[PDB]
């Protein structure tokens, strides 16, 4: 994922 928090 390009960012954190995507699960």
């Amino acid at each position: 994922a390009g960012h954190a928090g995507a699960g």
Epitope: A1, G2, H3, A4, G5, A6, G7
Partner: antibody
Framework: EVQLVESGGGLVQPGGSLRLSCTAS????????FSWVRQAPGKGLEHIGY???????FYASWAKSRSTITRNTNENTVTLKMNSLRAEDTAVYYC???????????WGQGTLVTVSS | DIQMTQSPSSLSASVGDRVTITCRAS????????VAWYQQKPGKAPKRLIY???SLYSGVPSRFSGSGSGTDFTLTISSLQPEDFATYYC?????????????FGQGTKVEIKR
């Protein structure tokens, strides 16, 4: 062409609440993750929280008990609500896709919220 | 408690000077890639100059370059212009699949000598 237009701001009594909204133009608010950031007068930038494209809101520890960051897909908006405001919460508030790792970055113009009796 | 510290916190330089700003993070950023450099004029929304450590967005002057790795980042201005007075911020993205943060350096104020 693409824009993030911020609306709200002004004077709030201590213990009151703020509600700030940003309207996206040129893109869909639910396609990306958006942060709210603030800057107290003469101070540095401070991250308030991040609403992922997946719809999960991660708040800074200092902000979590008082803050909510939500989005409205029909109106194409993202909104910050904060309650129990104190003088120390006086600051310019910005909505922003920070773009630390991706091509797309965009910020609202910022709006000053003053907390005072 | 994620910390980003810039060196120096303020500096003065003349037009044409080469200027360097360092930022160090207390832990590595997301994917060892998610760091941006921002430029803020007082009162105005910050403008992004560099993303993903070293990528220059279209329209950003070529005198700005970014470099570094995971925890130590550098903004270089090869030849300062008068319009480059501003506060410069390093911005990092951090976390895991189920936790997400951003952090800001404290800012480096750049004033122009003449």
């Amino acid at each position: 062409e693409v824009q993030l237009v911020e609306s709200g701001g002004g004077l709030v009594q201590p213990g009151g609440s703020l509600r700030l909204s940003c309207t996206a133009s040129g893109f869909s608010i639910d396609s990306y993750g958006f942060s709210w950031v603030r800057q107290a007068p003469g101070k540095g930038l401070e991250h308030i929280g991040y609403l992922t494209a997946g719809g999960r809101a991660f708040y800074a520890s200092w902000a979590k008990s008082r803050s909510t960051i939500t989005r409205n897909t029909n109106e194409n908006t993202v909104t910050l609500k904060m309650n129990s405001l104190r003088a120390e919460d006086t600051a310019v508030y910005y909505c922003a896709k920070l773009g630390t790792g991706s091509r797309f970055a965009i910020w609202g113009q910022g709006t000053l919220v003053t907390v005072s009796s | 408690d994620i910390q980003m510290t810039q060196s120096p916190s303020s500096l003065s330089a003349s037009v044409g000077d080469r200027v360097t700003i360092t930022c160090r993070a207390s832990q590595s950023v997301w994917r060892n890639k998610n760091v941006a450099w921002y430029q803020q004029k007082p009162g105005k929304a910050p403008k992004r100059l560099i993303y993903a450590i070293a990528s220059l967005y279209s329209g950003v002057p070529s005198r700005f370059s970014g470099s570094g790795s995971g925890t130590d980042f550098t903004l270089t201005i090869s030849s300062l212009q008068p319009e480059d007075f501003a506060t410069y911020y390093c911005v990092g993205h951090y976390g895991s699949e189920n936790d997400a943060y951003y952090a800001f350096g404290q800012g480096t104020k750049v004033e122009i000598k003449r």
